[PDB]
Amino acid sequence: SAVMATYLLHDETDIRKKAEGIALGLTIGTWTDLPALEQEQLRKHKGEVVAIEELGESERVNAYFGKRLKRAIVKIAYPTVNFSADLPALLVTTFGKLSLDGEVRLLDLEFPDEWKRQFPGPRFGIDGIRDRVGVHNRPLLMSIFKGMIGRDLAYLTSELKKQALGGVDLVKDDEILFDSELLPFEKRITEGKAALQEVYEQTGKRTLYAVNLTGKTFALKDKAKRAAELGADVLLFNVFAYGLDVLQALREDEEIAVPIMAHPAFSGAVTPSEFYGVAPSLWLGKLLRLAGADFVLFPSPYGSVALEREQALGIARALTDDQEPFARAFPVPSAGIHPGLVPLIIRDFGLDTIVNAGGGIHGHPDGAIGGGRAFRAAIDAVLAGRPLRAAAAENEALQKAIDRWGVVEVEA
Amino acid sequence: SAVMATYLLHDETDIRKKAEGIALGLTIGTWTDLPALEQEQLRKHKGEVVAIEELGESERVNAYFGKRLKRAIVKIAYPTVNFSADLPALLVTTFGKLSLDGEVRLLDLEFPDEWKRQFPGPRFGIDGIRDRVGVHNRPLLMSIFKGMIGRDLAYLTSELKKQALGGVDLVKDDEILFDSELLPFEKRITEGKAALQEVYEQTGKRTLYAVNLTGKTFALKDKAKRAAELGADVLLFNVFAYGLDVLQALREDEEIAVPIMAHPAFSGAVTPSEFYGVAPSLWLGKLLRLAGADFVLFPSPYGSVALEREQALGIARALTDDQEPFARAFPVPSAGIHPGLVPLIIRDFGLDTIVNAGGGIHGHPDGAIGGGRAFRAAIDAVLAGRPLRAAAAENEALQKAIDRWGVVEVEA
Numbered sequence A, B: 001s002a003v004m005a006t007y008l009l010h011d012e013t014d015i016r017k018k019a020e021g022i023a024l025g026l027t028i029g030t031w032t033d034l035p036a037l038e039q040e041q042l043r044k045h046k047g048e049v050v051a052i053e054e055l056g057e058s059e060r061v062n063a064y065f066g067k068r069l070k071r072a073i074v075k076i077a078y079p080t081v082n083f084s085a086d087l088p089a090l091l092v093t094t095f096g097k098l099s100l101d102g103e104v105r106l107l108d109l110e111f112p113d114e115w116k117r118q119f120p121g122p123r124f125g126i127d128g129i130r131d132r133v134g135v136h137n138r139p140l141l142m143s144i145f146k147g148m149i150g151r152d153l154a155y156l157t158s159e160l161k162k163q164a165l166g167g168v169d170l171v172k173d174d175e176i177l178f179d180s181e182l183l184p185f186e187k188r189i190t191e192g193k194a195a196l197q198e199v200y201e202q203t204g205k206r207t208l209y210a211v212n213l214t215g216k217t218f219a220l221k222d223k224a225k226r227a228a229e230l231g232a233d234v235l236l237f238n239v240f241a242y243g244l245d246v247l248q249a250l251r252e253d254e255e256i257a258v259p260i261m262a263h264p265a266f267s268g269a270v271t272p273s274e275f276y277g278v279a280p281s282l283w284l285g286k287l288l289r290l291a292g293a294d295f296v297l298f299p300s301p302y303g304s305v306a307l308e309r310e311q312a313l314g315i316a317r318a319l320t321d322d323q324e325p326f327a328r329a330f331p332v333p334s335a336g337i338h339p340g341l342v343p344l345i346i347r348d349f350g351l352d353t354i355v356n357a358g359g360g361i362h363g364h365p366d367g368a369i370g371g372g373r374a375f376r377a378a379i380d381a382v383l384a385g386r387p388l389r390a391a392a393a394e395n396e397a398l399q400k401a402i403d404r405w406g407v408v409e410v411e412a
């Protein structure tokens, strides 16, 4: 039983030698200097290089570093009896001291099924979320409050209703919205709920509110439990600013039992490099799903800072692969989103995704309501097998949006 | 009052545009469209671009990206009234969504003295640690257990004595040593304590044991309290696998009040890139000191994966700068350390540093005892104002080390 880590290494020295050094150094330390009695005793703890794939040199990389660097994908097996069954131990074992060893990037981690079962996975997952929001087939639609810092509860409820009246399925706090005297955590939840229950009357549409769960680590459980008691819909959580283990703790507390939406804030300090860090499919995908995120927002493959397409798809696959013993987590590609991209979003990610209108929903000629209607019309059009312009010719809200941002081609 | 973040940006679009966008977008969001009444109300919350230092375009960088990128250091002021007084809020505000914005690297964070005051700093610091171990003037000496995974308490005690008998001031668990039936956390503490007491009786030498504090986040405080009750000397903590806020929680708990040694494990997933992440002076230095680390181990500027000298010195400076309202934290340059490097270590870092013999101490011809004797002899030589070889001529352990690994010249 071992966790197999896959790394990308760049080095001017023999990679196999370095790899063997890692497998041994980060497990038992030494082997050839051990008596026979100790070798048999420590055998089960010995790490091993499972595979090495030569990638050939890159002149682009060589020029950058100013030297010839060999490249290779290295796989190392770390016996699970070597560490406790918790994420901090997993990270320290597979990428603790190793993260300091020059050019090494963690690409993936694979675990025996028995080890995976020691972790929770999402509590609700895609199926649970759809039931809680009451939308069973079409992809969901979410938006974000605009400029709420320094604003009051009257503004919050007002802006919340506008978005819900726009037909969005979920509205979340801006990740930088922290508790204040004007906007107390508990009050955002209770007033937000009452306000959304009003829109429920005016419009059968039921909208959820993902409230930001912030503050010090050891105060999180108490607040989350209170949120559950107050009937909060979803807890937005800046997991990377805390630790993966904290997300797991929130997921496993039966007194909370509220959906958790993981925000990508700070994940960029770890994922973008070609030579260092941890690949997004693992950092934002596999590990967050395993830890307990019901929703995972991640860099979309569209816009000014688009994540490489295959990377984005890799994240979504990790979140939804049904070969895993965990419920599926909702993939939410974020940033660079507009109604004209809905057709492409659905083609790339499928029906079980969430269209994140973000704060942009407010940039529609007719406010959030118009912005929400434009997105809902766009989603319906795609599912009905119709071109947006075709549907737009019958939907002004969508018409306005298309004229302002255009339509992205989905044909291959 | 406002926190000023300093960033390094690479981009093909106007840097000033992006800077203003960040200042506004990550604070109030909108300003021009707001009525004079709201502006005066939200003035307090408005972010501002403090300065922009244009840098010379880099041919190497342009060749790597295959595009011409302008470079600049941008400083942005974030009103402290915008976020709660905790590290997670600080990180999310200054490098949350921004960490996802292409090529942006966080270089530094400056806090108003008034804001810093809401954080603990080290509980003991350099002076407190020197008193706890009873060593003044000379730099301290520490070593690490070798090959403990899969071993028992009898082995731990025997290995601990060997190191203490070698004259080391502190011995720490390997950062990858997790709790097990063979080596329970509480047992390592009590058995280690007894063994170290026996050594004092024998040589009058005092040696501390830094025990690894691991496992799930919400079980840390309870076990740390037990450690304090059991008389643990120091708590080794893989902070980067848990979150900076957790370190602060351990520091602020009066029921713990045990020195904390922060390990660099996983910090390399964040610090190495030229274009992304967080600079080590901030990530390993300034923030860990503010959070409560009494010791900070960081990549040394020596050996196979040496950190650029200025970077290493920058970390030490942040840890010891007397201008901060926090006690100084012990700088511990780690990796690539051997007796022959002692003169340079002291010349580079001064006397208030710790020579980390690491696991290399066991590699001395005469085991850890000889290894420690070699290091102590080298330290005394520098303090006695004499060349290492002069002392080596009177100390066999030191000569063996020199002939084994050589002496690093310090003459400029």
Ligand SMILES: [Mg+2]
Binding pocket: A144, A174, A175, A176, B097
């Ligand atoms: Mg936001």
Ligand SMILES: [Mg+2]
Binding pocket: A097, B144, B174, B175, B176
């Ligand atoms: Mg170690």
